[PDB]
DNA sequence: AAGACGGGGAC
DNA sequence: GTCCCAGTCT
C-alpha cells in the first residue's frame, strides 16, 4: 500500500513540519552540519549550536580553513566530540579533493569520515534528491511499529532490515521529503512513550496499532571511575591546562591536570605527574559526571605554582581571563566553576 | 558483534 | 534513577 501510504505521510508532513533552522534551505553543507549535530542529540539542544556554528563557519570552505581549536570550541558542550573532528577532516577533504562540492554519489560521500549509512541518506536525499534511506532512531521506532518488527534494534543487522523496508516503500520521486517525513512522524507523533496513534496520519497502515502493542515497541536490549583533578594557580593569575590525547575519551579537548586515582590516594599520584614541580593541599569539593559507558567520580585538588622551567609537552600556561578561549568538557567546566565559587 | 563515545531533559 | 535522542567507528 506504498503509494497511498506515501500520500498520507507526505500530506501530514506539509501541514505539521517544524520550521527548524536547517530547513530554511537545502544547502548540502548546512544539511550535513545539522545532521552531524543531531546525532544522539535532541533538536532543542542543537538549535543554539547550529545557529552559532553557521554564523562562525558560513560555508564549507570557511569551516575547512578554520583551526581545529576554534572548531572544537564551537562544539564545546555538545558531546561526542569526534563527530566534529571527523566533520572537519571530511570538509577539508571535500575542498581539496572534490573542489568544494559535496559529492552527490553515495559511494563517494560515504567514504568521508563521520559519514555512516544514516548521514549518506539524510544529506544526499535531502540536498540532492538521491533515493537512499535515512534510518535513525525515529525511523526505526516508526518502522518497527508499522510492520510489527520485534527484532532487537540494538542488533547491528536490524538496521539493514529497516533500510531494505524503506527502499521498498519510499517515494522515489521525492526521497528527501519522504525521508524527512518519516523522521518527523517519529519525532512528533510516533513517540517513544504514549504515541498519538489516534491522531496518526498512517494509523490505518499500522500493524502495531491494530494489534495493540504500539507502546511495547520497538524491542531493545556502567563502570565507575574515580579521578583527581588539579587546579594550579600562578601567583600572576595564570592557570595550568593540558591538551588531551588525540585518540580516546574527550580527545583533543583541554582539561585541568588529573589522574585516575583508581582508589583513594588523592594528592599523591598527581604530584608525581611531572614528566615544573609542586605540591597540593586538601580537596575543595567533590562531584560526579556521567557519560554513556562510564561515570566519573572526580575530586578536585588546588595548589600554588612557582616557575622553574619552560612549559612544554601537552601542557600550556594560560591567564584566567583566557580560559573562556579553550574548549573544556562539561566536567572540567564545573571544576573551574567550583573553584571561583570557592575563592569567592 | 558489541563496546567506545557526551550531555541533557523528560518521566 | 532510566531512556534515548535525527549514529559512527573499531
Ligand atoms: S499508529 Fe501509533 S504506532 Fe502506528 S505509526 Fe502511528 S503513532 Fe506509530
Ligand atoms: Ca562510511
Short mmCIF file of C-alpha atoms (C1' of nucleotides) and ligand atoms in Angstrom, two decimals:
data_model
loop_
_atom_site.label_atom_id
_atom_site.label_comp_id
_atom_site.label_asym_id
_atom_site.label_seq_id
_atom_site.Cartn_x
_atom_site.Cartn_y
_atom_site.Cartn_z
CA UNK A 1 0.00 0.00 0.00
CA UNK A 2 3.15 2.03 -0.58
CA UNK A 3 1.79 4.78 -2.85
CA UNK A 4 -1.26 5.55 -0.71
CA UNK A 5 0.84 5.38 2.47
CA UNK A 6 3.19 7.91 0.88
CA UNK A 7 0.37 10.34 0.11
CA UNK A 8 -0.87 10.36 3.70
CA UNK A 9 2.63 10.65 5.20
CA UNK A 10 3.65 13.50 2.88
CA UNK A 11 0.33 15.29 3.27
CA UNK A 12 0.65 15.25 7.05
CA UNK A 13 4.28 16.46 6.79
CA UNK A 14 3.42 19.54 4.72
CA UNK A 15 0.99 20.71 7.39
CA UNK A 16 2.82 19.64 10.55
CA UNK A 17 6.52 20.09 9.74
CA UNK A 18 8.52 22.28 12.13
CA UNK A 19 10.31 25.33 10.81
CA UNK A 20 13.77 24.48 12.09
CA UNK A 21 16.94 26.47 11.21
CA UNK A 22 18.43 23.86 8.88
CA UNK A 23 15.15 23.64 6.99
CA UNK A 24 15.41 27.16 5.57
CA UNK A 25 17.24 25.76 2.54
CA UNK A 26 18.74 22.53 1.15
CA UNK A 27 22.37 23.62 1.04
CA UNK A 28 24.50 20.40 1.21
CA UNK A 29 26.83 22.00 3.74
CA UNK A 30 24.10 23.26 6.05
CA UNK A 31 22.20 19.97 5.91
CA UNK A 32 25.35 17.94 6.60
CA UNK A 33 26.33 20.10 9.59
CA UNK A 34 22.86 19.79 11.09
CA UNK A 35 22.72 16.01 10.51
CA UNK A 36 26.04 15.51 12.33
CA UNK A 37 24.87 17.72 15.23
CA UNK A 38 21.62 15.81 15.51
CA UNK A 39 23.44 12.50 16.03
CA UNK A 40 22.37 11.35 19.53
CA UNK A 41 21.41 14.91 20.43
CA UNK A 42 17.95 16.49 20.69
CA UNK A 43 16.72 19.14 18.27
CA UNK A 44 16.17 21.59 21.19
CA UNK A 45 19.81 21.20 22.19
CA UNK A 46 21.11 21.56 18.62
CA UNK A 47 19.29 24.75 17.57
CA UNK A 48 21.54 27.19 19.51
CA UNK A 49 24.70 25.36 18.42
CA UNK A 50 23.69 25.23 14.76
CA UNK A 51 22.97 28.99 14.73
CA UNK A 52 26.29 29.92 16.35
CA UNK A 53 28.24 27.40 14.25
CA UNK A 54 26.83 28.52 10.89
CA UNK A 55 27.46 32.18 11.76
CA UNK A 56 31.07 31.33 12.64
CA UNK A 57 31.53 28.96 9.64
CA UNK A 58 29.04 30.07 6.94
CA UNK A 59 30.44 27.87 4.18
CA UNK A 60 32.22 24.53 3.80
CA UNK A 61 35.40 26.40 2.82
CA UNK A 62 35.22 28.68 5.85
CA UNK A 63 34.96 25.61 8.09
CA UNK A 64 37.79 23.86 6.23
CA UNK A 65 40.21 26.79 6.77
CA UNK A 66 39.43 27.11 10.47
CA UNK A 67 41.94 25.93 13.07
CA UNK A 68 40.72 22.73 14.71
CA UNK A 69 40.90 24.52 18.06
CA UNK A 70 38.22 27.02 17.02
CA UNK A 71 36.07 24.24 15.59
CA UNK A 72 36.11 22.26 18.85
CA UNK A 73 35.34 25.39 20.85
CA UNK A 74 32.25 25.88 18.69
CA UNK A 75 31.24 22.32 19.62
CA UNK A 76 32.00 22.74 23.34
CA UNK A 77 29.08 21.32 25.31
CA UNK A 78 27.52 19.15 22.58
CA UNK A 79 29.15 15.82 23.43
CA UNK A 80 30.61 13.05 21.24
CA UNK A 81 33.36 15.39 20.07
CA UNK A 82 34.81 13.03 17.45
CA UNK A 83 31.82 13.99 15.34
CA UNK A 84 33.31 17.42 14.74
CA UNK A 85 36.87 16.13 14.33
CA UNK A 86 35.55 13.87 11.55
CA UNK A 87 33.35 16.60 10.06
CA UNK A 88 36.33 18.96 9.95
CA UNK A 89 38.56 16.35 8.28
CA UNK A 90 35.77 15.43 5.88
CA UNK A 91 35.11 19.08 4.98
CA UNK A 92 38.82 19.65 4.30
CA UNK A 93 38.70 16.54 2.11
CA UNK A 94 35.79 17.89 0.02
CA UNK A 95 37.52 21.21 -0.57
CA UNK A 96 40.85 19.89 -1.83
CA UNK A 97 39.66 16.61 -3.36
CA UNK A 98 36.19 17.50 -4.66
CA UNK A 99 36.55 21.20 -5.39
CA UNK A 100 34.33 22.36 -2.52
CA UNK A 101 31.34 20.40 -3.77
CA UNK A 102 29.65 17.86 -1.50
CA UNK A 103 29.78 14.61 -3.57
CA UNK A 104 26.32 13.56 -4.75
CA UNK A 105 27.24 9.89 -5.14
CA UNK A 106 26.56 7.56 -2.17
CA UNK A 107 29.82 5.65 -2.64
CA UNK A 108 31.80 8.91 -2.78
CA UNK A 109 30.05 10.66 0.11
CA UNK A 110 30.15 7.56 2.29
CA UNK A 111 33.97 7.45 2.26
CA UNK A 112 34.23 10.75 4.14
CA UNK A 113 34.80 10.48 7.90
CA UNK A 114 31.79 10.61 10.18
CA UNK A 115 29.53 9.70 7.32
CA UNK A 116 27.74 6.46 8.08
CA UNK A 117 24.65 4.87 6.46
CA UNK A 118 22.30 7.35 8.12
CA UNK A 119 24.10 10.54 7.07
CA UNK A 120 24.60 9.40 3.47
CA UNK A 121 20.86 9.05 3.19
CA UNK A 122 19.85 12.16 5.12
CA UNK A 123 22.22 14.54 3.34
CA UNK A 124 22.06 13.18 -0.22
CA UNK A 125 18.32 12.57 -0.29
CA UNK A 126 17.52 15.98 1.22
CA UNK A 127 20.16 18.03 -0.60
CA UNK A 128 20.44 16.13 -3.91
CA UNK A 129 17.29 14.04 -4.29
CA UNK A 130 19.22 10.75 -4.09
CA UNK A 131 16.94 7.76 -3.25
CA UNK A 132 18.85 6.45 -0.22
CA UNK A 133 17.20 5.53 3.09
CA UNK A 134 17.88 7.65 6.19
CA UNK A 135 17.16 5.43 9.17
CA UNK A 136 17.69 6.99 12.60
CA UNK A 137 16.21 6.01 15.97
CA UNK A 138 12.97 7.77 14.99
CA UNK A 139 12.53 5.79 11.77
CA UNK A 140 13.47 2.53 13.49
CA UNK A 141 10.76 3.11 16.06
CA UNK A 142 8.26 4.03 13.38
CA UNK A 143 9.00 1.12 11.09
CA UNK A 144 9.21 -1.29 13.99
CA UNK A 145 5.65 -0.36 14.93
CA UNK A 146 4.18 -0.16 11.42
CA UNK A 147 5.50 -3.57 10.36
CA UNK A 148 5.45 -5.11 13.83
CA UNK A 149 9.17 -5.86 13.83
CA UNK A 150 10.29 -7.38 17.12
CA UNK A 151 13.96 -7.87 16.27
CA UNK A 152 16.26 -6.13 18.80
CA UNK A 153 17.02 -2.77 17.18
CA UNK A 154 20.29 -2.80 19.09
CA UNK A 155 21.45 -5.64 16.84
CA UNK A 156 23.81 -4.34 14.17
CA UNK A 157 21.85 -6.18 11.45
CA UNK A 158 18.40 -4.93 12.45
CA UNK A 159 19.17 -1.58 10.78
CA UNK A 160 19.78 -3.36 7.45
CA UNK A 161 16.32 -4.88 7.69
CA UNK A 162 14.87 -1.40 8.16
CA UNK A 163 16.90 0.03 5.28
CA UNK A 164 15.51 -2.62 2.92
CA UNK A 165 11.96 -1.84 4.07
CA UNK A 166 12.50 1.83 3.25
CA UNK A 167 13.89 1.06 -0.21
CA UNK A 168 10.62 -0.76 -0.96
CA UNK A 169 8.10 1.85 0.23
CA UNK A 170 9.82 5.19 -0.31
CA UNK A 171 8.58 7.84 -2.74
CA UNK A 172 11.31 7.61 -5.36
CA UNK A 173 10.00 10.85 -6.86
CA UNK A 174 10.63 12.88 -3.69
CA UNK A 175 13.03 10.90 -1.46
CA UNK A 176 14.15 13.92 0.54
CA UNK A 177 10.66 14.87 1.67
CA UNK A 178 9.79 11.23 2.19
CA UNK A 179 12.75 10.56 4.48
CA UNK A 180 12.24 13.77 6.46
CA UNK A 181 8.50 12.99 6.88
CA UNK A 182 9.30 9.58 8.31
CA UNK A 183 11.70 11.12 10.85
CA UNK A 184 9.25 13.93 11.76
CA UNK A 185 6.47 11.39 12.30
CA UNK A 186 8.70 9.68 14.83
CA UNK A 187 9.62 12.98 16.48
CA UNK A 188 6.09 14.35 16.84
CA UNK A 189 3.51 11.57 16.66
CA UNK A 190 5.01 8.09 16.92
CA UNK A 191 6.96 8.94 20.08
CA UNK A 192 8.95 6.66 22.42
CA UNK A 193 6.23 6.90 25.05
CA UNK A 194 2.48 7.15 24.54
CA UNK A 195 2.50 7.67 20.79
CA UNK A 196 -0.51 9.57 19.44
CA UNK A 197 -1.93 6.73 17.36
CA UNK A 198 -5.46 8.25 17.39
CA UNK A 199 -4.04 11.29 15.58
CA UNK A 200 -1.50 9.42 13.46
CA UNK A 201 -1.80 10.01 9.69
CA UNK A 202 -0.76 6.43 8.93
CA UNK A 203 -2.68 4.65 11.65
CA UNK A 204 -4.65 2.68 9.07
CA UNK A 205 -1.43 1.07 7.84
CA UNK A 206 -0.07 0.28 11.30
CA UNK A 207 0.17 -3.34 12.41
CA UNK A 208 1.27 -2.38 15.91
CA UNK A 209 -1.85 -0.27 16.43
CA UNK A 210 -4.16 -2.95 15.03
CA UNK A 211 -2.54 -5.44 17.38
CA UNK A 212 -2.49 -3.04 20.32
CA UNK A 213 1.24 -3.20 21.09
CA UNK A 214 2.42 0.25 19.91
CA UNK A 215 3.70 1.07 23.39
CA UNK A 216 5.75 -2.13 23.78
CA UNK A 217 7.71 -1.41 20.59
CA UNK A 218 10.45 -1.16 19.49
CA UNK A 219 12.12 -4.06 21.28
CA UNK A 220 15.54 -3.03 22.59
CA UNK A 221 18.15 -4.71 24.81
CA UNK A 222 28.38 1.42 33.60
CA UNK A 223 31.76 1.21 35.32
CA UNK A 224 32.65 3.80 37.97
CA UNK A 225 35.93 5.71 37.79
CA UNK A 226 37.46 7.95 40.49
CA UNK A 227 39.57 10.88 39.26
CA UNK A 228 41.65 13.57 40.98
CA UNK A 229 41.80 16.99 39.32
CA UNK A 230 44.40 19.68 39.92
CA UNK A 231 43.79 23.42 39.54
CA UNK A 232 47.22 25.10 39.82
CA UNK A 233 47.03 28.90 40.03
CA UNK A 234 50.07 31.03 39.24
CA UNK A 235 50.55 33.95 41.64
CA UNK A 236 50.49 36.00 38.43
CA UNK A 237 46.87 34.99 37.91
CA UNK A 238 47.52 32.35 35.26
CA UNK A 239 46.48 28.69 35.31
CA UNK A 240 47.89 25.39 34.06
CA UNK A 241 45.94 23.35 31.49
CA UNK A 242 46.85 20.46 29.18
CA UNK A 243 45.50 19.29 25.83
CA UNK A 244 44.17 15.71 25.80
CA UNK A 245 45.30 12.70 23.80
CA UNK A 246 44.22 12.81 20.14
CA UNK A 247 42.55 9.41 20.46
CA UNK A 248 40.03 8.20 23.01
CA UNK A 249 37.89 9.87 25.67
CA UNK A 250 37.27 13.61 25.16
CA UNK A 251 40.03 13.62 22.50
CA UNK A 252 41.82 16.91 21.76
CA UNK A 253 39.90 18.79 24.43
CA UNK A 254 41.59 20.84 27.13
CA UNK A 255 41.39 19.98 30.81
CA UNK A 256 42.95 20.56 34.21
CA UNK A 257 45.78 18.12 35.01
CA UNK A 258 44.24 14.99 36.53
CA UNK A 259 44.73 11.26 37.08
CA UNK A 260 42.65 8.12 37.58
CA UNK A 261 43.17 7.78 41.36
CA UNK A 262 41.90 4.22 40.94
CA UNK A 263 41.35 4.12 44.69
CA UNK A 264 41.90 6.84 47.28
CA UNK A 265 45.43 8.29 47.20
CA UNK A 266 44.49 11.83 46.22
CA UNK A 267 47.31 14.36 46.32
CA UNK A 268 49.92 11.69 45.60
CA UNK A 269 49.71 10.04 42.18
CA UNK A 270 49.14 13.60 40.95
CA UNK A 271 52.28 15.31 42.26
CA UNK A 272 54.34 12.52 40.71
CA UNK A 273 52.92 13.53 37.32
CA UNK A 274 55.70 15.87 36.18
CA UNK A 275 57.31 14.04 33.27
CA UNK A 276 57.87 22.09 36.74
CA UNK A 277 57.03 20.60 40.15
CA UNK A 278 54.97 21.47 43.24
CA UNK A 279 52.70 20.13 46.00
CA UNK A 280 48.94 20.32 46.63
CA UNK A 281 46.59 20.70 49.60
CA UNK A 282 43.20 19.35 50.67
CA UNK A 283 40.09 18.93 48.45
CA UNK A 284 37.66 21.79 47.89
CA UNK A 285 34.55 19.88 46.79
CA UNK A 286 33.54 16.56 45.20
CA UNK A 287 31.00 15.69 42.50
CA UNK A 288 30.22 13.12 39.80
CA UNK A 289 29.94 13.16 36.00
CA UNK A 290 28.20 10.57 33.80
CA UNK A 291 28.88 9.74 30.16
CA UNK A 292 27.25 6.74 28.45
CA UNK A 293 29.73 3.92 29.02
CA UNK A 294 31.30 5.07 32.30
CA UNK A 295 30.97 7.51 35.21
CA UNK A 296 33.49 9.95 36.71
CA UNK A 297 33.98 10.31 40.46
CA UNK A 298 36.27 13.34 40.40
CA UNK A 299 37.70 15.15 43.43
CA UNK A 300 39.47 18.49 42.97
CA UNK A 301 42.85 19.48 44.47
CA UNK A 302 44.10 23.11 44.39
CA UNK A 303 47.65 24.41 44.83
CA UNK A 304 50.24 27.09 44.05
CA UNK A 305 52.54 27.31 41.02
CA UNK A 306 56.11 28.61 41.04
CA UNK A 307 58.04 28.80 37.76
CA UNK A 308 61.18 26.71 37.39
CA UNK A 309 61.25 25.85 33.70
CA UNK A 310 59.61 26.16 30.25
CA UNK A 311 56.02 24.96 29.79
CA UNK A 312 56.19 22.21 27.16
CA UNK A 313 54.61 18.84 26.36
CA UNK A 314 50.78 18.83 26.15
CA UNK A 315 50.76 21.39 28.98
CA UNK A 316 50.15 25.10 28.33
CA UNK A 317 50.14 28.11 30.66
CA UNK A 318 47.14 30.41 30.31
CA UNK A 319 45.80 33.56 32.03
CA UNK A 320 42.50 33.19 33.87
CA UNK A 321 40.77 35.64 31.52
CA UNK A 322 41.81 33.50 28.54
CA UNK A 323 40.32 30.19 29.69
CA UNK A 324 36.99 31.01 28.05
CA UNK A 325 39.00 30.70 24.82
CA UNK A 326 39.67 26.98 25.12
CA UNK A 327 37.26 24.06 24.78
CA UNK A 328 36.68 22.21 28.07
CA UNK A 329 34.49 19.14 28.73
CA UNK A 330 31.43 19.81 30.92
CA UNK A 331 33.08 18.03 33.85
CA UNK A 332 36.13 20.30 33.95
CA UNK A 333 33.94 23.31 33.24
CA UNK A 334 32.31 22.66 36.60
CA UNK A 335 35.68 22.15 38.29
CA UNK A 336 36.53 25.74 37.43
CA UNK A 337 33.08 26.92 38.47
CA UNK A 338 33.54 25.41 41.93
CA UNK A 339 36.99 26.98 42.15
CA UNK A 340 35.90 30.59 41.59
CA UNK A 341 32.85 29.83 43.73
CA UNK A 342 35.34 28.88 46.44
CA UNK A 343 37.71 31.85 46.13
CA UNK A 344 34.51 33.89 46.35
"C1'" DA B 1 29.09 -8.29 17.35
"C1'" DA B 2 29.48 -5.35 21.00
"C1'" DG B 3 31.66 -1.56 23.40
"C1'" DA B 4 33.56 3.13 22.99
"C1'" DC B 5 31.97 7.78 22.58
"C1'" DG B 6 28.86 13.47 25.99
"C1'" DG B 7 25.42 15.83 27.77
"C1'" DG B 8 20.94 16.63 28.71
"C1'" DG B 9 15.80 16.59 29.64
"C1'" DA B 10 11.52 14.15 30.12
"C1'" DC B 11 9.17 10.72 33.39
"C1'" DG C 1 17.27 6.75 38.56
"C1'" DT C 2 16.11 5.37 33.32
"C1'" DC C 3 15.60 6.26 28.48
"C1'" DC C 4 17.40 7.99 24.23
"C1'" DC C 5 17.91 11.47 21.21
"C1'" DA C 6 17.79 12.82 13.60
"C1'" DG C 7 24.72 7.34 14.85
"C1'" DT C 8 29.69 6.19 13.60
"C1'" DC C 9 33.85 3.61 14.27
"C1'" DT C 10 36.71 -0.27 15.66
S1 LIG D 1 -0.37 4.42 14.69
FE1 LIG D 1 0.70 4.69 16.53
S2 LIG D 1 2.33 3.18 16.49
FE2 LIG D 1 1.45 3.21 14.46
S3 LIG D 1 2.83 4.68 13.36
FE3 LIG D 1 1.05 5.85 14.19
S4 LIG D 1 1.70 6.59 16.12
FE4 LIG D 1 3.14 4.96 15.44
CA1 LIG D 2 31.14 5.33 5.81
#
